[PDB]
Design a protein around this nucleic acid. Structure first.
Length: 58
RNA sequence: GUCUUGGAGGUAGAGCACUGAUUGGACUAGGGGCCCCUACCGGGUUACCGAAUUCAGUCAAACUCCGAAUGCCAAUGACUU
């Protein structure tokens, strides 16, 4: 399942468990839209980052 | 990194399984009181303290029969980087 991921809130000030999981999705600017296919791995990457990332169904 | 799975460790919490500390009641070994007599063996009075033991109930960084949340060490399946 294709799945948009955007940054509604930046990376400054969050701890660096909440940066690498942001980084390993390729996110490197706010409101950058990197679309990976949905998977139980990647659904577990948005659990740790939920106050920061909006998912989107495709 | 993220999910699954495997773990080590005795923390925060709790509870008393021990090391301690402790409230109150039954239980009363011992003691004291008071007399009798003790010239001595001893006995009776306790709304007098009281060891054990027991019914509950409290609290511990140097208390754990118990034990989380994460966190670390890796595997092999990937999905990014």
């Amino acid at each position: 399942a294709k799945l948009e991921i955007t940054l509604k809130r930046s990376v400054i000030g969050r701890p660096e468990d909440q940066r690498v999981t942001v980084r390993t999705l390729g996110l490197k600017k706010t409101n950058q839209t990197v679309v990976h296919e949905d998977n139980a791995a990647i659904r577990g990457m948005i659990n740790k980052v939920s106050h920061l990332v909006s998912v989107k169904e495709q």
